Amino acid sequence: HRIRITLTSRNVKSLEKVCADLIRGAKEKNLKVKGPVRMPTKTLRITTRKTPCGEGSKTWDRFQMRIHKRLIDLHSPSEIVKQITSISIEPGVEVEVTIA
Amino acid sequence: GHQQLYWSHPRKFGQGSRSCRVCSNRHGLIRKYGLNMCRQCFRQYAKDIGFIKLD
């Protein structure tokens, strides 16, 4: 019964919230809940010339799109967590809940 | 005769074979992460994709 709740966010304020609020509230229900596992950043680097044409000087952009991944370890059947999750949903994090 | 001689290029490789999703221009396609975007349009509309110059 290892539920593996994948938490991938573009933003930090929501990645902190969604991971914490599914533990902070899941302390009161007394189930053996673990802390959020970390994964390293992926900085999707697309470095484009600022100029549409090839004239002027060569001022390059450095477009940095960092993406992060967390998951939380559990000893729980599916329905127990589902009661907590869909209440208070925010746009940032992609919550992909694994059963196995 | 015309119809078979209308799409007779092998359209599976070359910058002419592929095309832009915004503008249908055959130069400066971002083929990293399959953005497949004319670099001039990427620059303008990367703000609402998520690409932001934080550094």
Partner: peptide, 19 residues
């Protein structure tokens, strides 16, 4: 998903879809 689009591709596909 059967094609199984990547998580680098996800936020790009999330990005362009919005934009």
């Amino acid at each position: 998903m059967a094609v199984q689009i990547s998580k680098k591709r996800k936020f790009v596909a999330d990005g362009i879809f919005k934009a």
